[PDB]
Amino acid sequence: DRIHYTGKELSNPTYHDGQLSPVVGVHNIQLVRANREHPEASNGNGWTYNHQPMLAYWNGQFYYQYLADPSDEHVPPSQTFLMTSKDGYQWTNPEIVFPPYKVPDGYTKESRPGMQAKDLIAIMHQRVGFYVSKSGRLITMGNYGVALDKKDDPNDGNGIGRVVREIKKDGSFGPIYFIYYNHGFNEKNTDYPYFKKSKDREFVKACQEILDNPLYMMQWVEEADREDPIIPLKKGYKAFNCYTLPDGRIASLWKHALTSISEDGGHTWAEPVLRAKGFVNSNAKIWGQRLSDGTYATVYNPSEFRWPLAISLSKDGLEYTTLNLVHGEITPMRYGGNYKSYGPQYPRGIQEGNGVPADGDLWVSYSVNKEDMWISRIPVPVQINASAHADDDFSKSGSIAELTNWNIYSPVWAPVSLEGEWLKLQDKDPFDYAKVERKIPASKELKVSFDLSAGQNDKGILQIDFLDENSIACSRLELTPDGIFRMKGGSRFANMMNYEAGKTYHVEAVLSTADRNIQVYVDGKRVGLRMFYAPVATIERIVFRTGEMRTFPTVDTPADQTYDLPDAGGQEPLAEYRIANVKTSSTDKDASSAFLKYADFSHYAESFNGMEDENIVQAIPNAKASEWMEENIPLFECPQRNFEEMYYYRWWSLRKHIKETPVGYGMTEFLVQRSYSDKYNLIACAIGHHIYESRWLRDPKYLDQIIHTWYRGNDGGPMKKMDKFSSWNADAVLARYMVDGDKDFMLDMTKDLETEYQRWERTNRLKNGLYWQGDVQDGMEESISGGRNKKYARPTINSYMYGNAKALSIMGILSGDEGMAMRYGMRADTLKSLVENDLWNTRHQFFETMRTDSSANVREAIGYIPWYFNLPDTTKKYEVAWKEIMDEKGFSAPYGLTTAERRHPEFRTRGVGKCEWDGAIWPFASAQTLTAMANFMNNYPQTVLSDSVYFRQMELYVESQYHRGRPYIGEYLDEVTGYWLKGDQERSRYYNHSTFNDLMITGLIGLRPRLDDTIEINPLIPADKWDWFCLDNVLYHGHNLTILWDKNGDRYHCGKGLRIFVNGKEAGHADTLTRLVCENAL
């Protein structure tokens, strides 16, 4: 429909930069610095009105056209220059491309009776300067109008006409011809031939493409004859540009952000034309385009004044959501003159079809004060914030072109180069300074370090500011021209020390928002402590600048400037400064989180403590929980409310069970005092679940102690009641190692785990080799297949021990104990056969309990436990068992997965509300089933279950964890009604007898933990389920992982698609959601 702005962010015109934080890596590069007094090729021979640039990319080179008069706008002479560059930093000297044209003596106007032209030079004015033809030829174009005095209009449509000439591959120009004649002008009374007279047949064809193209005719409306038939839309809307939307339609922008649409390539435009709603724009033009990443961007002055120069982003070319800085400086205007006004202005980029710069970034040409010519480069995909602190070695970079993390303001006479290891700042400019900004993650506690060297101590200045997102400097450090390194405390400064030329100084600055101070160390010695002169919430930028900041101009300055400044062409004596090894760090508790911040999710914990009473308090009370969470949890977000809420609830629930005991932390299952628990109310049944979920906690002291408390909490040794429940806890300890990477912790647990395995082996094998367990001792009393006081061979314990044997064998390889590897290796092989041969029911095609005489002939949730440890072959015969996930006669029920198949006669026939396992949904089981389903779908060639099927069950598991409208994780629930079956009894509250966040992280987000240094993800969120999602602040293998998906690129602004970040640096990428693997990035 129409271009519009919906962002809340505004630009404040009492500041030069608007209090807009810039986007990352924007380089401001001055191309032309006016100097009347010392005219030269490189400044267009001392002309001081230089304005209205145009840009194109052709044969790997930038082409930059600007126009100039000697001093005053619409005061002759007047010409148009051309400039080139391979990289966009180092430019060739301005070359006169359209020279001054003679107005015929005796020219007149209706609006100027009695006046008539004598020896009068034409004024030039184009809204459009370039065209790449279909045959790859580059045509540049200009217009000549007439001004009989300074108050006259040469874009009145009584002009002379429009000229063109070819720019050739070799640099040289072709001849100059007219392409359009204003009324009363023709071949007979003009100084260049008509374009058609050229004998270059293809040059004519190229010129003719411009006339035939209606999108170019839209840009001639201002200068051309009024009502000329070749102008598609005849109303005089100003400085047209346009771009192609994703659907093929063309959107347009003119001055004051007027905007339309065209569904026929530019012949017609949707009435009524109106301002883009929510945009802030005036005279100084707006520029929009598509970018290499397929998104869009607008560049404009968001102000009735012509400052700052800003960028707003859009994913669809219509709805613009952001507003940040491109150019916030304002060189003061050296040379006065007619209609010149302060600030960066007339932004204009590359039309569609006229070039793609090889680096894929956004380059935009603009003037400053109608005086100096500039270009800015903005890295695409455009990034707002720094995903990673500084650790910059400049010797790795050949030229500033490669410093995509630094923002650079670089005037001609205050340039920014590299000198190997050093980022260098030169300043011989009285009216300007060199400035570099380094944007970093917004931080409350901040350390910043770098080496600093001056080339002098008797001249110039350097200011070091520490800014927030609204450009508030919280303190400043200064190298003074009277030889001192000092800090700003308030109005008063503090002299920290003297300084010397040519000497490296290691500067470290330690800033704290909370404490509201800065400490400055130089060579390990503290040399200054002051308070902030201005308070901030966070610091996001360090700025190095070769000058004091400039107060002029302001919103109250008069727009017209009659004066030149004193010594306008002169120079300061050269000052140099150098910096190297810029490091930053933060002690903030979520500093490891690359994109998400805990403050945006702190509300979840707040809601949970407010929503209901705190019945039982153990080590971490509710009042400290929000805080514990910040320190310990990976952050997650997605567009779906329930999944997100559950993510934060299951950590907030889990933490209640961290319990203080004399021998260390332990992890409870019931909060209430159970009659049969061991010491400290501990229960062994779900230790597997506890470890699998708690391994993602970042502070290891909790899980370290919880484990040690089981195996060593009872006079040095194991707790007694590990004899009471079957265990997969050796697999679970090796599951922990796969997430934290800590060999030592694990290898230390090996004997304790061998003791355990061997105990179960002595006590609980039948004579054929299979393990037996009574259904009670699996934690599954009154199960259908069963066995209260029975020694049936249940696929639970048999699979748990397969897992344990497999685990201990691996611990053997890593121990260096090749005997233990083998011994437990064969224990693994053996149990794998006994399950595959003796427990596969061949009628049912399903793993099932074997009673003393034959199979129990009932499919239960336990029949999916062999895949919890990847027990089965990849053969197709087993795939069929997973069909029962999607069958309402099997396990598919309204609120998730049943514990037994629903088709069975005996399903849920042993009463209710006393913990029965003959059908009802048990989170314990559901989590075993989903972990196994995850393993199936990840590690097996497999056609039975889609992404959608996995997601469905996790979604149902989310929906099931509510009670009275609030989140709730109870013991067990009704498969049809969703009723938690102990009701409002206290004992079921916050029950810790399952996983959820392991499932979120390992199945859904699909971070697959491994023994080695490959990172493997494989989300089971289906294509198009969610426009974005992100798992951040994960402590995998002593490195900080972020995993994110951004369909349109507009959620995180770091690219489209799926991405892995290790410590905030990208490690891999994928256009869709599939398996994405990053080798050796740890």
Q: How many CB atoms lie within 10 A of CB 36?
A: 17
Q: How many CB atoms lie within 10 A of CB 379?
A: 17
Stretch in the footprint of ligand AHR (CB under 6 A) among 406-414, 680-688, 959-967, 1041-1049: 680-688
| Amino acid, single-letter form, for residue 713 | G
Give, as ranges, the residues between 779 and 808 that touch ligand AHR (CB under 6 A): 779, 781
Strands, E assignment, 707-818? none
Q: Do residues 1003 and 1013 make contact, with C-beta atoms less than 8 angstroms apart? A: no
Helix (H/G/I), strand (E/B), else coil: 640: coil
Contacts (Cβ under 8 Å, ≥6 apart) of 611: 966
Rounded to whole angstroms, how far apart are CA atoms 139 and 129?
8
Q: How far is the CB of 312 from Na ion (least distance, A)?
A: 13
348 or 690: CB nearest ligand AHR: 690
Helix (H/G/I), strand (E/B), else coil: 652: helix
308 or 569: CB nearest Na ion: 308
- Which of 142, 268, 123 minimizes the C-alpha distance to 210? 142
Q: Which residue is nearest to Na ion (CB)?
A: 470
Stretch in the footprint of Ca ion (CB under 5 A) among 421-429, 592-600, 752-760, 842-850: 421-429
Q: How far is the CB of 915 from ligand AHR (least distance, A)?
A: 4
Binding partner of residue 547 among Na ion, Ca ion, ligand AHR, none, CB cut-off 5 to 8 Å per kind: Ca ion
Give, as ranges, the residues between 910 and 949 that touch ligand AHR (CB under 6 A): 915
Q: Do residues 251 and 243 make contact, with C-beta atoms less than 8 angstroms apart? A: yes
Among 427, 630, 884, 1046, binds Ca ion (CB under 5 A): 427
Q: Do residues 714 and 679 make contact, with C-beta atoms less than 8 angstroms apart? A: yes
Residue 1023, both tokens:
């294509």
Rule CB under 6 A: is residue 686 a binding residue for ligand AHR?
A: yes
Stretch in the footprint of Ca ion (CB under 5 A) among 31-39, 91-99, 419-427, 758-766: 419-427
591 or 683: CB nearest ligand AHR: 683
Q: How far is the CB of 756 from Na ion (least distance, A)?
A: 58
Place of tokens 């809204």: 127
Contacts (Cβ under 8 Å, ≥6 apart) of 395: 420, 421
Q: Do residues 128 and 141 make contact, with C-beta atoms less than 8 angstroms apart? A: yes
Rounded to whole angstroms, how far apart are CA atoms 416 and 418?
7
Q: How far is the CB of 870 from Na ion (least distance, A)?
A: 51
After which residues is the chain discontinuous, taking C to N > 2.5 Å? none
The contact mask relative to Na ion for 5-24 (x = CB under 5 A, - = no) is --------------x-----
Rounded to whole angstroms, how far apart are CA atoms 511 and 847?
62
Q: How many CB atoms lie within 10 A of CB 946?
A: 13
Binding partner of residue 685 among Na ion, ligand AHR, Ca ion, none, CB cut-off 5 to 8 Å per kind: ligand AHR
Binding partner of residue 915 among Ca ion, ligand AHR, Na ion, none, CB cut-off 5 to 8 Å per kind: ligand AHR
HSE, side-chain direction, 13 A CA sphere, residue 1020: 29
Rule CB under 5 A: is residue 975 a binding residue for Ca ion?
A: no
C-alpha distances out from residue 355 to 61, 290, 329, 377, Å: 9, 12, 28, 15
435 or 541: CB nearest Ca ion: 435
Binding partner of residue 433 among ligand AHR, Na ion, Ca ion, none, CB cut-off 5 to 8 Å per kind: Ca ion
Among 547, 787, 803, 825, binds Ca ion (CB under 5 A): 547
Eight-state DSSP code of residue 835? I
Stretch in the footprint of ligand AHR (CB under 6 A) among 83-91, 327-335, 683-691, 842-850: 683-691
Give, as ranges, the residues between 430 and 459 that touch Ca ion (CB under 5 A): 433
Stretch in the footprint of ligand AHR (CB under 6 A) among 395-403, 639-647, 654-662, 682-690: 682-690
Contacts (Cβ under 8 Å, ≥6 apart) of 1068: 1015, 1059, 1060, 1076, 1077, 1078, 1081
Binding partner of residue 465 among Ca ion, Na ion, ligand AHR, none, CB cut-off 5 to 8 Å per kind: none
Q: Do residues 1028 and 1054 make contact, with C-beta atoms less than 8 angstroms apart? A: no
Stretch in the footprint of Ca ion (CB under 5 A) among 110-118, 130-138, 236-244, 422-430: 422-430
681 or 750: CB nearest ligand AHR: 681
Q: How far is the CB of 308 from Ca ion (least distance, A)?
A: 20
Give, as ranges, the residues between 154 and 193 that touch Ca ion (CB under 5 A): none
First-to-last CA distance in the chain?
Answer: 48
Residue 738 CA to its chain's centroid (Å): 27
Place of tokens 């120069």: 309
Q: How far is the CB of 20 from Na ion (least distance, A)?
A: 6
- Which of 800, 902, 798 minimizes the C-alpha distance to 860? 902
Q: How far is the CB of 867 from ligand AHR (least distance, A)?
A: 22
674 or 712: CB nearest ligand AHR: 674
Stretch in the footprint of ligand AHR (CB under 6 A) among 124-132, 315-323, 681-689, 827-835: 681-689
Residue 1033, both tokens:
């602040």
Q: How far is the CB of 431 from Ca ion (least distance, A)?
A: 7
34 or 667: CB nearest Ca ion: 34
Rule CB under 5 A: is residue 538 a binding residue for Na ion?
A: no
Q: How far is the CB of 222 from Ca ion (least distance, A)?
A: 38
Q: How far is the CB of 646 from ligand AHR (least distance, A)?
A: 22
469 or 879: CB nearest Na ion: 469
Contacts (Cβ under 8 Å, ≥6 apart) of 762: none
Binding partner of residue 686 among Na ion, ligand AHR, Ca ion, none, CB cut-off 5 to 8 Å per kind: ligand AHR
Binding partner of residue 427 among ligand AHR, Ca ion, Na ion, none, CB cut-off 5 to 8 Å per kind: Ca ion
Among 683, 746, 862, 973, binds ligand AHR (CB under 6 A): 683
Residue 235, both tokens:
């109303």
β-pair partners for 5: 320
Rule CB under 5 A: is residue 470 a binding residue for Na ion?
A: yes
Among 400, 579, 685, 784, binds ligand AHR (CB under 6 A): 685
Rounded to whole angstroms, how far apart are CA atoms 306 and 310?
10
Binding partner of residue 470 among ligand AHR, Ca ion, Na ion, none, CB cut-off 5 to 8 Å per kind: Na ion
Give, as ranges, the residues between 116 and 135 that touch Na ion (CB under 5 A): none
Residue 982 CA to its chain's centroid (Å): 45
Backbone torsions φ then ψ of 290, nearest 5 degrees = -75, 155
409 or 636: CB nearest Ca ion: 409
Rounded to whole angstroms, how far apart are CA atoms 245 and 289?
9
61 or 322: CB nearest Na ion: 322
Q: Edge-to-edge, what's the strand order for the sheet holding 1015-1017?
A: 1007-1008, 1015-1017, 1076-1078
Task: Identify the burial level of 1078 via C-beta atoms within 10 angstroms of its C-beta, where 0-12 means exposed, 13-18 middle and 19 or more buried.
Answer: middle
442 or 687: CB nearest Na ion: 442
Q: How far is the CB of 166 from Na ion (least distance, A)?
A: 46
Rounded to whole angstroms, how far apart are CA atoms 711 and 458?
70
Among 372, 588, 669, 754, binds ligand AHR (CB under 6 A): 669
For the CA atoms of 226, 227, 233, 239, what is the dihedral angle to 10 degrees? -10
| Amino acid, single-letter form, for residue 224 | A
Backbone torsions φ then ψ of 651, nearest 5 degrees = -75, -45
Q: How far is the CB of 670 from ligand AHR (least distance, A)?
A: 6
Stretch in the footprint of Na ion (CB under 5 A) among 436-444, 470-478, 791-799, 1025-1033: 470-478
Give, as ranges, the residues between 319 and 348 that touch Ca ion (CB under 5 A): none
497 or 915: CB nearest ligand AHR: 915
Binding site for Ca ion (CB under 5 A): 427, 429, 433, 547
Question: Which residues here bind Na ion, judged by CB under 5 A?
Answer: 19, 469-470
Binding site for ligand AHR (CB under 6 A): 669, 674, 683, 685-686, 779, 781, 915, 993
